[PDB]
Amino acid sequence: ETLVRPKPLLLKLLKSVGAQKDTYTMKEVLFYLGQYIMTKRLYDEKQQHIVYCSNDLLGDLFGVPSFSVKEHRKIYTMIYRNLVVVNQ
């Protein structure tokens, strides 16, 4: 359980979909991010691993206009950019 604390913008996104804390496990962060994508319907209808985030908060956070869930390392990299790993 990698304990992390999301920076301001990411925390805003997590809260927008139900999150109530300031400290999370990476699993929790991924869960909320997934719910954000689903709630906003940012995925491609035909190939649902494709995510469109241009002109969206997620796009500002990740720094890309689109991406595929298949891009595992890139996603973790884009996520960690918006987090700090607790010393604990």
Partner: peptide, 8 residues
């Protein structure tokens, strides 16, 4: 989507 996302 969820199915793919779980793979992370």
């Amino acid at each position: 989507f969820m199915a793919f996302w779980e793979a992370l």
